[PDB]
C-alpha cells in the first residue's frame, strides 16, 4: 500500500468517531468543525435540506443539525452573571446576604 500525497484536498483521510449526545445539560460539544459550549435542546426551527447550522442577528452560531438523525438542535451558553453582597455595617453585625 503506497500513499500518493499531493496539493489536493486529500479525499482519503480516515474514519471519525461518535458518542451518544446529551440534552438540557451544560456540556462542551463538537460538530464536524463547529466546536463550542452550551446547552443542547430540541429546536422548533424548520431548516431546509442543504442548510447545516444557523446564525442569529449577533452573527454567532445558534442552531446546529445532528449529522446522524437529521434533526435540529439549539445551543445556549451555560448561565453566568455577577454577584452582589448586601450587608449592614460591620460595626453592627456580621450577617450578609447574597444576590445573584
Amino acid at each position: 500500500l503506497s500513499f500518493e500525497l499531493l496539493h489536493a484536498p486529500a479525499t482519503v483521510c480516515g474514519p471519525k468517531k461518535s458518542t451518544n449526545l446529551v440534552k438540557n445539560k451544560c456540556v462542551n460539544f463538537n460538530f464536524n468543525g463547529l466546536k463550542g459550549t452550551g446547552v443542547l435542546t430540541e429546536s422548533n426551527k424548520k431548516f431546509l435540506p442543504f442548510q447545516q447550522f444557523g446564525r442569529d442577528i449577533a452573527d454567532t452560531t445558534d442552531a446546529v443539525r445532528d449529522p446522524q438523525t437529521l434533526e435540529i438542535l439549539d445551543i445556549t451558553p451555560c448561565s453566568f452573571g455577577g454577584v452582589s453582597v448586601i450587608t449592614p455595617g460591620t460595626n453592627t453585625s456580621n450577617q450578609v446576604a447574597v444576590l445573584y
Binding site: 442569529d56 442577528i57 449577533a58 454567532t60 445556549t76 451558553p77 452573571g81 455577577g82
Partner: peptide, 30 residues
C-alpha cells in the same frame, strides 16, 4: 384596567416601542 393608568398614559405607553438575548449572551447585562 389592572395597570391603574389613565386613558392618556396608555397611549404614551403603547406608542413607544430578540436582540436582547443575543447581546446578553455575549457578556453584557441590563
Amino acid at each position: 384596567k389592572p395597570s391603574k393608568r389613565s386613558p392618556i398614559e396608555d397611549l404614551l405607553f403603547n406608542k413607544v416601542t430578540d436582540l436582547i438575548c443575543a447581546q446578553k449572551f455575549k457578556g453584557l447585562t441590563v
